[PDB]
Amino acid sequence: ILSAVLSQEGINILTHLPKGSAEAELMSVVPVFYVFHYLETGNHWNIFHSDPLIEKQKLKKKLKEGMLSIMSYRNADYSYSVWKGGSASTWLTAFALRVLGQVNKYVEQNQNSICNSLLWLVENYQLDNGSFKENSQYQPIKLQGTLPVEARENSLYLTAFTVIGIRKAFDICPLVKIDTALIKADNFLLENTLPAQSTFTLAISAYALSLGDKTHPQFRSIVSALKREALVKGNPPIYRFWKDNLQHKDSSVPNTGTARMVETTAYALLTSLNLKDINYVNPVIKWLSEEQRYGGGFYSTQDTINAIEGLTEYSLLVKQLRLSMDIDVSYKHKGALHNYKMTDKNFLGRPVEVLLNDDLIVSTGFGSGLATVHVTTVVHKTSTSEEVCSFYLKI
Amino acid sequence: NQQGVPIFYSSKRSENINHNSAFKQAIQASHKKDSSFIRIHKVMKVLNFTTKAKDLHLSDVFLKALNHLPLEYNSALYSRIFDDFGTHYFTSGSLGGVYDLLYQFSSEELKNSGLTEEEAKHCVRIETKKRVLFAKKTKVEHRCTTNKLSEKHEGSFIQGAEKSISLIRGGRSEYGAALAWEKGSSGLEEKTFSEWLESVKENPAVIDFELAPIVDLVRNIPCAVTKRNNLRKALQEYAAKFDPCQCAPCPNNGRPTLSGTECLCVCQSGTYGENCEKQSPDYKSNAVDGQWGCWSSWSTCDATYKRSRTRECNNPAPQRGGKRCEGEKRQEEDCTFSIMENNGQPCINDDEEMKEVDLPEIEADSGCPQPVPPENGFIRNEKQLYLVGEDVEISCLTGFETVGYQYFRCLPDGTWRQGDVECQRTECIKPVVQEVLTITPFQRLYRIGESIELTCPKGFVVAGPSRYTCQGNSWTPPISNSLTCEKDTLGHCQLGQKQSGSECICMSPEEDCSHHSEDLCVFDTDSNDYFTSPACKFLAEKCLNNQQLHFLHIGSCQDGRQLEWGLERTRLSSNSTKKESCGYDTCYDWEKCS
C-alpha cells in the first residue's frame, strides 16, 4: 500500500478558488467537485482538524452554487458554450457531462436536461463512422491546453474525449439510441487507433475504451502498445510515467520535454486503474506523487482533474482488494464439510480432503477480496481403457 | 544593463571594469565640481581557454557548501551561496592585464582650454605615448602643450586633472600602483611600465570572458534535481535585492546607483553637489526622464496557470519633455500550486529515464518469466518476475470463455505447470469494418447462428458475399479488406462509351475490354455472317464499325425464331427512320424500349 493523500492546504486552495474574470470562471469551479468525490468516496472528511460533519455540508453549499454556475454555459438547445452569443462547442458539451456525471453520485441532477444535452452531441455531431466533430467558431481555450492536435489526430482526441463524457453520465439517461452511439464510436477508436500517432492520443483513446469493454481483442492490443512506451527510473521500476513524443520531432529545446506528459501518463494511470492491475500502477502513483516535486505543479486544471480522479480511484481500489473472505465448502446433500474464514492475517487457511461423493459447493456471502479455490481430484484407471491405452499387450 | 528571462552573457558588453572604490571614487569625486571624464585603456592578452562542456570537476569547498543545503526551499540559506561563491562561471575567456585609467577634469577648465572632444581625447592619447609608454614617439602638437590649460601645468594636459582613477587589472601590484598618479610616482620611471608588462604574464587577471549560470554546475550531488531547481527559484528572489529600483530618485535626472546598502546619486553633465542639486549656470535644463518603481509582489496563482506583477512609471515620473520610461508595466508568467504531498519534501537526483522494453536483464531471482497465454486468451495478472509458487490466472478475450483449468503455477524449476485450459466460445464480434459498407443489424456481439447483411449506397453493390453467418467461432468468412462496393464503369456516357477526360469518348476494343460480360450474338455487314462475341468488345466496336456491326440476340448464338428474327431485324435496317438503342444496339422504328 502506498500513500496518496492531499495537503491540508491544497484542498483549501481548490475549494476557495480565485475570482473576477468570467474567463476560466468554470475552470474556477470544476475542482471542488473532484475534491468532493475524492473526499467523500475515499472517506477522508477526517483530515480537517475542525468539525468534519459541518465541513461536509460547507462544501455541499459551494457544490450546488458551483453546479448552477456551470449551467451558465448551457445554450438554448442544451449544448454548452462559453458565450451564448459565443458559440456552441462540441468540446465543452462533452466536458460538462463528464463533470456532471461524477457529481451525480451525491448531488442529484436534472435528468431530462442531461438527456437533451446528450442527444445534442449524438444526433448532430457524429459522422457515419462514429467519430465526433468540433462544431465551429473553433476557439483555442486556456483551459483546454494540450488538446489541440494535428491532422486526424484531433478527431481521435475529440471522439475519445466526448466518449468519456458520455460514458461518465450514461447512467442518468440510458437511451437505446445513445448506447448505439457508443457502440459506433468505440469501434472507431479501436479500429482507428492502432498505428499510434501520439502518446497523448494513445492514452486518452486507451482510457476511453478502458471505460467500455475491457476484455476486447483490439483493446488489449492497444493497451499493450501504451504499456510498451512507458519510462522507468530504477530497474525493477521504482518510478513510471509517459512522455509525449514520436521519433520525428526532435529539437534542442526545453518545450518538447513538456508537461503534456503529466496529462498523458494520467490517462495511462486511469486506464490501468480500471484494469485493476495494481502491480503496474504502483510506481506511477508513487511517481505522480513524486511528480509534484519533479513537476512543480500541474500546469492546467485539465490534467489536475484527472490526476485527482486517479488518486481517488486508487485509494478505493485498495479498499476493494483487501482480503476479508468467509468461504464455505459443503456437500449439496450430505452434511456440512468444513469451512474457513480467511483474511490478511490468515490467508491460505488450509487444504482438506473430500470424504464423500456428493456434489461440492464452495461459496462466500458478500465479502471483500480475491480468493483461489483448487480442486485437485485423484483417481485410478485400469490399463486397457481408451483413455490411457491404445495397444493389446501380453508377456 | 540586461539583467532580464534566462541570464547567460558576454563581457564585451558591460565595459564597466569598476571596483568597489573604482566606481565609488568617481561618483564621490563627481560631487566636488561639475566634472567630465576621460578614459584610456590598453588590453594585454595572454591566453584563451575553453571550459569543457560536460563532466566538470567541482571544488571541495564548493561541493561542501553546496551540500549543507536544506531540501525544502529556504531563500535565507540559499541566497548565502551566491554571496560566497557567485552566480556564473567561465565557459571561455582571456587572461592578462589592462592599462585602464579614468581622468577627472573640471568642466570649467576644459571650457577654458577650448579643445574639441577629439582634441582632448588625442592629447591624452599622445601624451600617454610620450610619458608612460616609453616609445620614441609621434611628434607632439603644441596645440596640446601651449593651450591655456596645459600652459598652467608645464605643458601637460594630463597633470591638469583634479585626479585620475586606476582601473588597472593585472601584474605585480608594486608596478601597477606606480602607474596611478602619486607625487611619489610623480617623478616615476617609464622603466616602471615595461617591467609591469612582463609581470602581467606571470600574474594575470581574467578579462574579456563569457559566463554561464553557477546553477548549471550543480548536477551530480545527493539531491541534484531537488537542489538545482530549489536554486533557480532562489536565484530570482536574490536578483531583486540587487536592483536599484528601490533607490529614491535623485534631484536632477540623476540616475541613482546602488552599492551595498546605499544609493549614491550619479549626476547629469553640468550638475554637481552631494545629490546633484548644485549646478553652475552652464546647466540650462529642467527636463526629467521617467524611471520605474520597483516591481509588484506577485498576485496569488490563478484560475489559469497565470500570475500578475506590475510597476508604474513613477519613481521619477517624466516631466516637461523627459524620456518616457521603457519596458513592461505588467508581467504574466504562468504558475502553480502544491497539492499531493505531506511527508517528504523529496529527493530526486539526476537519474536516467528509459523506455521500459529495452531493459530485460536479471534472472538470479529464480521466479518464472511471464508465460504464454493460450490462443484467444490473456494473463489476468502482469509482472516481469513471479515468485516460485505464485499462480497466474488465464482468462479469455471477448466472445470466448474459459474451458477448464484456468491457472499456471510457477515452479522452482523456473518452469510453468500448464493447465487443462482452452478458449472455446462462439460469439462473433462486429467484423473487420471497411468505412464504405454498413452491417445490419448493428450489435456489439452476435450469437452463433445470426446473420449480418452488408449493404451499400444505391449506385453500388458488395464485392464479396452479402450475408455472413456466425458458426464455429468464425463467420463464413469476412474479407478483412478484400471487400467494398464499386459500381461498373467507375455526365454519364452511353453504353458504347466510357468517360476519360470529362468528355464522353469511346472505349477502345483492344484495351478496356477484359471484364467478362455475357456472350452476345452479333451480325456483321462486312462478313455477311455473324459471330458470338463478348459484350464489352461489341459496344466498343459500335463506335468504329456500328453501321457494319449490329446487335442481335442475347446469349451465345443459337438457332430459332430468335436468330432468323435478329437477321431480319438488321436486314430491315435501311428503311427504319428511328432506331432507339437502350441496352440493345437499337429498337425498331416500331418498338419501344421497355
Ligand SMILES: *[C@H]1O[C@H](CO)[C@@H](O)[C@H](O)[C@@H]1O
Ligand atoms: C523589478 O523589480 C523586482 C524587484 O527588485 C525584480 O524582480 C526585477 O528584476 C525588476 O527589477
Ligand SMILES: *[C@H]1O[C@H](CO)[C@@H](O)[C@H](O)[C@@H]1O
Ligand atoms: C525600469 O527598467 C527599465 C529597463 O528594463 C529602465 O528603462 C528604467 O530606468 C527602470 O529601471
